Every structure is written in structure tokens, then in C-alpha cells.
Design a protein around this nucleic acid. Structure first.
Lengths: 111, 100, 155, 48, 143, 116, 50
RNA sequence: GACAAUGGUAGGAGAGCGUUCUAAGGGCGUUGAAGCAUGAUCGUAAGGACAUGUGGAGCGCUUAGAAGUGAGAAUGCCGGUG
RNA sequence: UAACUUGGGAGUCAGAACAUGGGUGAUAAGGUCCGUGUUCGAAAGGGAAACAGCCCAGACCACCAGCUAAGGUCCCAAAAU
RNA sequence: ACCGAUAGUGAACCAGUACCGUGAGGGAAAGGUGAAAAGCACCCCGGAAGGGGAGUGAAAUAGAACCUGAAACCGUGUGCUUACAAGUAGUCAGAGCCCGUUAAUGGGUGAUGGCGUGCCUUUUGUAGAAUGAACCGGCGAGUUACGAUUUGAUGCAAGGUU
């Protein structure tokens, strides 16, 4: 079939996460662990979690071989933002957007 | 082997077994209509072209009678609050060509 | 309106020198939560017309029933106490359509009560004939006495 | 016949309702012309 | 309704060659821009190029009427401030005749993509020679 | 009563957003540029229906002229001879004789010369 | 200065063409078996062997 | 039939469309109402239907009546997002 | 084919260019102020390259029909090398 | 023939409250799971949050952020197309390629050719380098009362009317 995992309302701006997700999209899932494990970026650990969960949804509760698995569809959507404030000078105030993201990964076996 | 006829204020080049869309004739569905105004005939075997030709007039079926797609005529004047929208659907009849 | 909505009475910012539009109070029409510009006023709708036209209309409303077979005279009813069973039975044994106007001479107790539970039966007296309710119905039930009342009254 | 009701012919009109678009005729300036004293709300030389 | 339109599948293109000896620049350029643009075919359609492939030879033998040998300056600006350069039809009929001819004819074609692609149908050569022998160049003459 | 009408605004704004699909970028998404582009589109269409009768005319004349010059005639003298000979086909629109049946076009050219 | 005119979301995505980030440049460890980062020490199991 | 007219701002005149509620009439609706989305439908325009998904409980049609009755501009107001 | 009277409802009171008769200015001004006509205003279409006011001409709608007006006919660009 | 959550009281909800001000004083925002909490036992990934199953339920894309769920905006994939071109972004003509409808002179895309300087306001005159609007959605401007007049309609008519 096609297994998927989701991480809803992660506290990272989604267009910082799309950077990392544009690396693992379409890779043999045996690579994608190591790729996410070796890169500088910060959105990589909280995607390693989601990937390993979507791969532990393949062996368990379905029955798939987790060598035969490519990362078919990874992506990230916007969540609810936390709008804060930052005092500029002279009485001004500038809004801040602590944005979130929903990280969705779907691994398949090509069958 | 074609013929040039004139039906609705417009010449038309026609051959044997051709569909034509002409403006709204006065004939009904199915009943055959024979064009009398022929301006040219020829193509392959004869060549008669004249101020007009008496004979071999096109015998053609009257296949369908309907209304074309709706154009929406719109025109406006800028900075002057003056716009106008009409709709239009041009009636036509389609004929099949039997004989020349 | 602007006067009645609570608050207001302070200019939210200077007339000049801020980037924003010049605004008078927080309770103007366009402001969310503002006063309403025009709209519902507490008022009345009743008017009148000449008396002759009243009598003319109330006679048209009955000539229409006589044009049709809406009218059907009967005698004074008889009841000891109000009961809707016999009343519905009488109404059904007279080929009457659903809504009948039961016009009695004077106000009656043994008829109003046994009639006013039914869906479409309206009892009324010659003192209370209505252009609305003659035409609402399509079947009259008057008594042999109230009819003379109305012809003596109506012109 | 309380569901077929026709008033006399010529006895009722719509009210003119200005300020509802250019097609009605009285849309933008609502019949008042352009700038002036007779184009303001409440603005009008008193009678006589 | 019915009116013919030429396609990429429908169009055939012939080659022509024409001596410029004894010719005037403009009087040749007009009759050649017509052939390039392809409006002597019967199947002329505006949107596709039904034109032909024209070869011009003996471009060192064109003529100029009146005092154009020294007048009739060609100007061109390099887009640098003060970068305007000047030449004359005399100093170009002998120095680079196959650009004289090119400019004269290419100012006569419309300035669009189809016109840009139609201008490169023109192959201009001084002297009576040309490398386009494998094309079966047909011999045209003006009128 | 209070007429809090909000179902009709959306409906006509949809009907005008959907009349501009295929337009570059924001022109097919936002009501206030899509509406302007639909107005301009209707105006251009009104104008172009008039010009489409003027463009094909010049096209037909171009091609009839290209055909007649092969027989060594102008367009002008061809049409003069035609109008003078009585032979009065829709000679511009029927630039199809020149392509389809070329021998009949030689026919017409010879009649045109005979009228001179 | 201020932008005179907002950036169309086509020009935004054109400017963001080169904002992609590159692969880590990794290899397979000849001892760990798992992946290492070339010229670095295997985080997973042990030595560097160089 | 025949003939005439049919550019148009300020402005005058006329005929209509649609929303909300009411009266009367006559319907539809868990075998699926409004609403939303999709379409290549119908009318001269405002507009109307139909099929299809989603939705899960009210809605239309006829004739009249009554209006907080129609939004693209007010450095409008409020919210959301670029 | 209008004219007039009686009534209901108005908007308008910043006009412009060109041609012609003048004042003022310097026989300056796309100046300014009057008479006279037209066009724009409130007018789209063809021509004057583009160009409210110049020339032709007044759009009910549709047609891949014809005759023409100003203006044109070597190529751009329809039609006379 | 009143509102129905930007409406109706400022306040449908712990509202004269957060909050703002030395003070007098100003003052919001905030409703809706389901018929019934039956509010997700147990397993798996994970530090947890969050998920995927199994369940409850008529329905879980009804999971307490809980009816429907639009637009802006942000994404993922693909059918046509685009790296010699001077673009108020469209309209008319049109090859090619790709599909197949409220079945009708079909829908998508668009090589190339013609024409073409947004809208509103104010002006003699604005493509205007004059104004206004980032976008989207909701709210937002000739009304009511009592009098005068003029018109049409109706009832009577030297009477008419409360």
C-alpha cells in the first residue's frame, strides 16, 4: 500500500523545512536516514523522527519490507502561527510570526 | 467538381455531399431546398462562369435549424459611467448538398 | 443611531499628522460596532379610508361568496354546552370545505367554543364581519337571524 | 381569492431608490449633479 | 468559414539567385524583400513564412543614383556616451557590399519574430560565386 | 427586516472570476483585476469582430494579386475587367478558385482580358 | 528605499531558484557500513582509518 | 406589412432582475433542505435551472405586501493572509 | 416637421481648439477679451507616424459579402514600379 | 411582517472584565463535538507533542483548535508549453499536441500574425509623472414622522369627510 506519518504543529517555519524536504523527496529510504543525519540544518532531526515513524508504520500494522521503500511523497504545510510583538524605537511596535508546520511523509513499496 | 452559389448576401463554394452552415432560410426541417442563384460551376470537367447561370442549380437538403453559440456583446466608456451588455445568438440552418 | 450607541465622544487620533484616515468617533456608521445610519423606527402602519368605501368593500366580500356558492344559510344553532364533536359532524354533513366562516346573530357561547378548536373554523358575529375573513374563507354558515342583521346594517 | 390579489392598474409604483449603480440612472451623484451647495446633505438655500 | 491556411506540413520553399549588376540598391531591395516575405505565392498566410530562399551575387556591382556615393551616410550608435559611428555608401560598396545589401533589404521586412526568421533566408555574396550549389538555385530575374 | 445579504456577492464574483481563466497570474484569481480584464476583453472582442471582416479582405486581395501577376496582370486591371465583363463572383472571398481549380482561374483571366 | 510595486509570485519563485541547498557529500563507511561524511570520523562506530 | 428610429455624460421618463420577511395557495425534503464546490446549460441584461461531489435539516414555487434590499473605491472600519 | 401655452422634475453659471471679423499685446504667445461657425465636452470608427479640438464620417446586433469618403497604390502596409 | 453572533445591549461566553490612564475616564475580543461522552481500551514509532492502526459512533476529513468550511495565501503531482526575446498581459486569426461535454458548428494548451497606454475621481483636457485602492472577506451612505403641492387610482359627487 502506501504508509504515511505526520507531525502536526512543529515549531519551525515551513519554508525552512521545505529546504530539507527537497533533498529526501524520491530517495531510497535507506539513504534518507543518513542524508537527514549528516546535514547542517536544524529541521533535520524533527524530520528524522517523522521518517522513522512512517517506516515503523510499514513493518508494523502493515506488512512491508523496509528495504523496498522509497520516499514517495514528502511535504510540509502551514500550521497556526503565533503572533508576537517586538518593540522598535519611538513607541513603534513590529509584529512577529512564530510560524509552525505540518510535516507529512509518505513511504511506499512501489506495488 | 464544385459550384459557387450566392444565398444570404454571401457567395459559397460547394461540392457534392458537403455540409454548409447558411443564415436562417425560410424552409423547415428535413424538406429540401434548391438554390437558384448559381455564379460558377466547374472544378474538374466543365467550366461555366458567367454573370449568372441558368441550370444545374444546387439541390440540397435542409439538415438542421438552430441558434449559434451566445456571444456576449459588451462595451464601456472609461471614466464615464456608461457600460452596456447585450447577448446574441445568430440563427442558422445547416444544409446537406445533394446535386449540382 | 450615533446618538444612542454607547461610547463615542472622543476623537481617536489627531486630525493631521498620522498616516490613517481622519475619523471622528469609534461609533460612526462604517466602524465595526457603530451606530446605524437609517433603519427601523418604532412607528405605526394603520390608516383609514372613507366609510362608504368600507361598506362597499364589505359588500363586495359577500357578493363574491354569493357569486359562487360560498353562502349557505342555516337556522340558529342549538347546544346545551360546548362540544366540538357534534359541531364537526354538522360541518361535515353540509358538504362544507375546510375553512368556513360561521356568522351568528349575536355573540354565542355554545358555538364559539365548540368551533374554535378546529383547523379552519372561525366563528364571528354580525357586529364583527371582516373584509379579510369573509375572503379568507370559501364557505359561509350564517343563521336565519344574523342575515337580516347584516342586511339591515350594511348599505 | 386571497392568493390572487391585483391592485388597480396604475395605482402602485416602485419608489425611486437612488444610489444603486450606474444602470438605474441615479447611481453616483444620485441626481444632484456635481459639487456645490445643492449637492451637500441638508444643503439648500432656504425657500424664497 | 472556408479559407485556406498553410501549415508547416504544407509549405515548400524554393531557392533563387539574382545578379545585382547594373541594379539600383532600392529597386533591387524592394523586389527581393517581396520574395523573402513570400507574397508572390498564392498560398500567402500572414502567420507562417511561405517565403523563399534568395541568393544575391555580384553585390560589389550595385549602383547609386546621383551623389549618394559620398552622401547617404550610415550612422550607428554603440550605446556608450559619444559612441556614434559614421560611414558612407562609397566606403561600404567597396569595403563591405554584402552588408550594404543586407541592411537595405532588411529594413524592408517587418520587425517581428517572423520577420527576423525571414531575414535569414537572404544570402548575400559579392562576386559571382556562392557556396549554395547543393540547393538547385533557380535563376530569377526582376521586373 | 434585516437583509444581511451575503450569498449574492460571492455568486456574481464567482461568475466573473470564472469568466477569466487562462489569464496570466493574478488576472485569473482576484476579483478586482479579473473584472477589469473582463471589461477590456469584452471591448477588445467587440472591436475585433469588426476588424476580422477587414483583415481577411486584405488577405484575399493579397493572394488574388499574387495569382493574377503570374498571368501578367495586376489586381486592379483584373478587377476592372471582371466588373466590366459582368462576371461578378464574390471575387475577393472566392480566392479559392485561384488555389483549387487553376484552369478555371485561367478561364476568368482570359475573360477579364476580353473585357479589357 | 521602499519597493515601488509588490513582487509578483512568479518573480519570487524565479529569485528563489538558487536558494536550494546541496547534498552533504557523504560516503559509505568501510567499517561501520553505515554512511559517513567524507574526511570525517564515523559517528556510528569507531575509527577513521586514514 | 411598409416605412422611420435605435453614440451618449449631467439630467428626465419607462420596464425589469435579485436578497430578507409576511399573507394566502399549492409543493419538496433523511430514498437527503439550505450552503459550498464542479461543469462544456438556458435568457437581451440584471439572472435561472440541471447534473455531480461534500453537507446533515430545513427550504422553495404562485400572487400580492413590507423593506436595515444589491458594494470596487470613502489615506473607509474589523479580521485573515501575502 | 415642428411651434406655442399650461403644469411636474432637473442639470448648467471653471469651457477648449481650429477657421474667420476685431480690441489688447510687440500684426508675440497653446496669451487674453468679444462676434461668427464647427468639432471636443457628451463621439466610438478611417486618415494627420503617434496626436481630445485638424480632414472624412455619426457605432442597435451578427456575417471569412459588395460600393465608396478623406487619404492613397516600390517594401514595412491593402491597391499603378 | 424585531436581531440572530462584525447583527442585538459596550457585554449570548465569569463584561464594565483583559487592557490603557496619576486621575476623572476610555474599553474590547471570546457561542456551536455528538442523540448519548459512549471523550479513543490495547499495539506500534517517538523523551514528549504528534502520529499509524484497533476501537466508540450513523459519521472521527464529528477527536474538546471539535456543525458547514469560501477567498486571499502556501504547497505536492502532473497534460500542453517556454532559455534571440522589447510584452496594460488581452482580443481576432491559427498549426501542432492532449483529452472527451448539460452532445454542440466540443474542452485544454498555444508556435506565429494583426489590433491594442489599467480602473475610479476630478477636469477644457489624465496612459498620465494628478487622486485613491497590497490582496481577500464581512460591515458601510436619500430614511422616517408630520405638513404643502403635483400626478395616477378609487368612493361619493354641490356636496365630500371625520
Amino acid at each position: 500500500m502506501e504508509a504515511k506519518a505526520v507531525a502536526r504543529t512543529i515549531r519551525i517555519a515551513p519554508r525552512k523545512v521545505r529546504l530539507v524536504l527537497d533533498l529526501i523527496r524520491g530517495k531510497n529510504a535507506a539513504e534518507a536516514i543518513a542524508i537527514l543525519k549528516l546535514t547542517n540544518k536544524a529541521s533535520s532531526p524533527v524530520i528524522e523522527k517523522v521518517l522513522m515513524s512512517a517506516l515503523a508504520n510499514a513493518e508494523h500494522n502493515y506488512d512491508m519490507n523496509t528495504d523496498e521503500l522509497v520516499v514517495k511523497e514528502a511535504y510540509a504545510n502551514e500550521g497556526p502561527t503565533l503572533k508576537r510583538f517586538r518593540p522598535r524605537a519611538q513607541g513603534r511596535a513590529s509584529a512577529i510570526n512564530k510560524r509552525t508546520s505540518h510535516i507529512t511523509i509518505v513511504v511506499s513499496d512501489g506495488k | 467538381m464544385f459550384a459557387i452559389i450566392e444565398t444570404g448576401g454571401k457567395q459559397i463554394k460547394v461540392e457534392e455531399g458537403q455540409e454548409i452552415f447558411v443564415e436562417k432560410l425560410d424552409v423547415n426541417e428535413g424538406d429540401t431546398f434548391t438554390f437558384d442563384k448559381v455564379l460558377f460551376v466547374g472544378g474538374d470537367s466543365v467550366k461555366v462562369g458567367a454573370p449568372t447561370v441558368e441550370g444545374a442549380t444546387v439541390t440540397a437538403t435542409v439538415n438542421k435549424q438552430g441558434r449559434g453559440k451566445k456571444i456576449t456583446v459588451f462595451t464601456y466608456k472609461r471614466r464615464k459611467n456608461s457600460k452596456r451588455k447585450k447577448g446574441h445568438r445568430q440563427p442558422y440552418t445547416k444544409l446537406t448538398i445533394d446535386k449540382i | 443611531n450615533r446618538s444612542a450607541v454607547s461610547g463615542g465622544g472622543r476623537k481617536p487620533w489627531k486630525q493631521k499628522g498620522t498616516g490613517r484616515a481622519r475619523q471622528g468617533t469609534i461609533r460612526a456608521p462604517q466602524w465595526r460596532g457603530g451606530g446605524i445610519v437609517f433603519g427601523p423606527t418604532p412607528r405605526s402602519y394603520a390608516y383609514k379610508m372613507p366609510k362608504k368605501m368600507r361598506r362597499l368593500a364589505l359588500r363586495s366580500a359577500l357578493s363574491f361568496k354569493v357569486q359562487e356558492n360560498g353562502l349557505t344559510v342555516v337556522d340558529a344553532f342549538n347546544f346545551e354546552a360546548p362540544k366540538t364533536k357534534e359541531f364537526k359532524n354538522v360541518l361535515s354533513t353540509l358538504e362544507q370545505p375546510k375553512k368556513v366562516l360561521v356568522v351568528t346573530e349575536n355573540e354565542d357561547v355554545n358555538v364559539e367554543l365548540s368551533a374554535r378548536n378546529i383547523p379552519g373554523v372561525q366563528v364571528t358575529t354580525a357586529q364583527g364581519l371582516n373584509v379579510l375573513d369573509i375572503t379568507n374563507a370559501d364557505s359561509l354558515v350564517i343563521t336565519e337571524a344574523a342575515a337580516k342583521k347584516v342586511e339591515e346594517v350594511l348599505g | 381569492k386571497l392568493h390572487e390579489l391585483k391592485p388597480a392598474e396604475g395605482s402602485r409604483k416602485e419608489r425611486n431608490r437612488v444610489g444603486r449603480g450606474v444602470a438605474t440612472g441615479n447611481g453616483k451623484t444620485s441626481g444632484r449633479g456635481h459639487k456645490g451647495q445643492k449637492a451637500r446633505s441638508g444643503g439648500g438655500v432656504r425657500p424664497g | 468559414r472556408q479559407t485556406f491556411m498553410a501549415n508547416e506540413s504544407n509549405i515548400e520553399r524554393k531557392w533563387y539567385v539574382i545578379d545585382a549588376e547594373g541594379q539600383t540598391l532600392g529597386r533591387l531591395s524592394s523586389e527581393v524583400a517581396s520574395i523573402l516575405r513570400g507574397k508572390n505565392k498564392v498560398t500567402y498566410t500572414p502567420h507562417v513564412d511561405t517565403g523563399d530562399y534568395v541568393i544575391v551575387i555580384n553585390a560589389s556591382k550595385i549602383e547609386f543614383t546621383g551623389n549618394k556615393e559620398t552622401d547617404k551616410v550610415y550612422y550607428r550608435h554603440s550605446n556608450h556616451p559619444g559612441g556614434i559611428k559614421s560611414i558612407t555608401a562609397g566606403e561600404l560598396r567597396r569595403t563591405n557590399p554584402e552588408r550594404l545589401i543586407e541592411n537595405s533589404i532588411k529594413g524592408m521586412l517587418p520587425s517581428t519574430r517572423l520577420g527576423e526568421k525571414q531575414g535569414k533566408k537572404l544570402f548575400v555574396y559579392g562576386g559571382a560565386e556562392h557556396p549554395h550549389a547543393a540547393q538547385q538555385p533557380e535563376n530569377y530575374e526582376l521586373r | 427586516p434585516r437583509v444581511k445579504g451575503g450569498t449574492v456577492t460571492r455568486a456574481r464574483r464567482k461568475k466573473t472570476i470564472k469568466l477569466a481563466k487562462g489569464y496570466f497570474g493574478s488576472k485569473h484569481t482576484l476579483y478586482k483585476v479579473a473584472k477589469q480584464q473582463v471589461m477590456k476583453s469584452g471591448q477588445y472582442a467587440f472591436r475585433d469582430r469588426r476588424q476580422r471582416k477587414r483583415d481577411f479582405r486584405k488577405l484575399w486581395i493579397t493572394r488574388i494579386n499574387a495569382a493574377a501577376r503570374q498571368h501578367e496582370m495586376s489586381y486592379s486591371r483584373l478587377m476592372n475587367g471582371l466588373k466590366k465583363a459582368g462576371i461578378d463572383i464574390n471575387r475577393k472571398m472566392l480566392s479559392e478558385i485561384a488555389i483549387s481549380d487553376e484552369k478555371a482561374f485561367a478561364q476568368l483571366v482570359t475573360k477579364a482580358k476580353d473585357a479589357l | 528605499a521602499v519597493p515601488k510595486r509588490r513582487t509578483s509570485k512568479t518573480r519570487k519563485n524565479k529569485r528563489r531558484t538558487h536558494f536550494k541547498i546541496s547534498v552533504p557529500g557523504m560516503t559509505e563507511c568501510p567499517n561501520c557500513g553505515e554512511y559517513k561524511l567524507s574526511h570525517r570520523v564515523c559517528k556510528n562506530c569507531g575509527s577513521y582509518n586514514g
